[PDB]
Design a protein around this nucleic acid. Structure first.
Lengths: 257, 257
DNA sequence: GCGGTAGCCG
DNA sequence: CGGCTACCGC
């Protein structure tokens, strides 16, 4: 079996007490991480090596930042989109254990009336052309990450109220779904269709977990031949309940490979 | 037995992971704290209550701040000196288990040539008069705190280097010793008159403990009849080695009463 | 809320 | 080094 996970860590240097024990327990083949919030020269790579994980990383000071930890040595590592602004701190790609892995931290967008929202839409359009150009859909590939898009009403707690939210607004949803149409399968919905499963609970929301006030903007998207072999996918609530948790949960997929 | 401790905590809300386990393990009758750095309405009372400790506290935002935790309910609680500026955030006094407890965070002084050092000197003069007026030296009383004064050469690592340091300058030493000559016994020196023992190691001095690069500016001072019963007094080095420690060490005195 | 940033400070 | 005052981002 092959296990691939994705996890927005909200600062890797402030989350090793979660990530390292979680890797020891769950032993995924590949863990994609977002919002590492660290410059490359300060990335805590030794902490991963000591538990038998390779780790590749791309980030700048204070914000954004992406990394992939793996049991097998990553090859053919690249950073960013292939056009300006490259945003190396938002996209890291590698061939790992025969899998083409693309890990994205999509711009969140701030508010729909902002320049940042237009930048998010443009990023999703650029990502479309990037993946159309570079992904072999007859091969095993996974596009993982924190997409900052909840594509269907089941992916948000209150679809009726969130029409103007940057993570649920129609333009972002349409742009994200345009990429899925290339032939990515949202494996969470292969296994758990139409089921309230959230990968994010806002720190600011009192009792968020207990009252089900979450979002599902994180995804593992697999090419058709890999998706066909997906036998499980779930969000792990345990690290979200631990002391000093990330606001996101890991999302885990298991393939019959 | 009766156990009394003093501990400069460098922000109580940042030090509960040290202080609460420390109380549970050491079970002192009285713990005086300095540099709590918290306004009264935000003092973490419940943390002490849930381990069976009373706590009384006096402080404003971000600087200074004093508190006393005790097994027995404090009585006749007062804040500050009895003259303007009162500095309620630098003195808290209470009758606890029949003992008159005075907890001070003496002005540090900054530099020898500054208005702040003058303020430190007049504060010590004011404290002399306050204690002379209000302490019965026939009764059980303890004056403890972070005095920001190392009275003798044994109390500092480099007496020569530090002649003009605010915590070891002759003016502050004589002002402090003037208070002691009222009848206060520095119990650390009753038990360990000749030992190099420190209650502070600067965070910035790498290897300070091994290198003996410490200061002893914290004290537990007892009236003669209480002092006569002192059987032990030591600084606890263990919490100084802990993750995210205070820069100061708990100073502990035990009395056979 | 709770990550990050900078400069101030002992 | 690790508190503070502030701010910034999600």
């Amino acid at each position: 079996m092959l296990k691939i996970a994705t996890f927005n860590v909200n600062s890797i240097r402030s989350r090793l007490h979660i990530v390292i024990p979680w890797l020891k327990e769950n032993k995924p083949d590949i863990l994609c991480m977002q919002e590492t919030k660290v410059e490359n020269r300060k990335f805590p790579e030794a902490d991963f090596h000591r538990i038998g994980y390779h780790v590749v990383f791309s980030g700048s000071k204070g914000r954004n930042g992406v990394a992939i930890a793996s049991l097998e040595e990553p090859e053919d590592v690249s950073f960013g989109l292939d056009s300006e602004p490259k945003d190396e701190d938002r996209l890291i790609r590698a061939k790992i254990a025969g899998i083409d892995v693309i890990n994205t931290y999509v711009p969140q967008g701030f508010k729909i009336d902002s320049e940042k929202y237009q930048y998010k839409l443009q990023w999703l359009e650029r990502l479309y052309h990037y993946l159309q150009k570079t992904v072999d859909f007859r091969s095993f590939a996974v596009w993982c990450g924190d997409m900052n898009v909840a594509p269907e009403p089941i992916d948000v707690h209150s679809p009726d109220k969130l029409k103007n939210h940057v993570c649920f607004h129609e333009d972002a949803r349409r742009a994200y779904k345009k990429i899925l149409e290339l032939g990515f399968v949202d494996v969470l919905r292969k296994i758990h269709p139409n089921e309230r499963i959230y990968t994010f609970y806002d720190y600011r929301v009192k009792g968020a977990i207990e009252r089900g006030l979450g979002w599902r903007g994180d995804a593992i998207l697999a090419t058709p031949p890999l998706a066909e072999r997906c036998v499980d996918c779930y969000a792990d609530i345990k690290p979200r309940l631990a002391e000093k948790p990330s606001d996101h949960l890991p999302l885990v997929a298991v393939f019959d490979v």
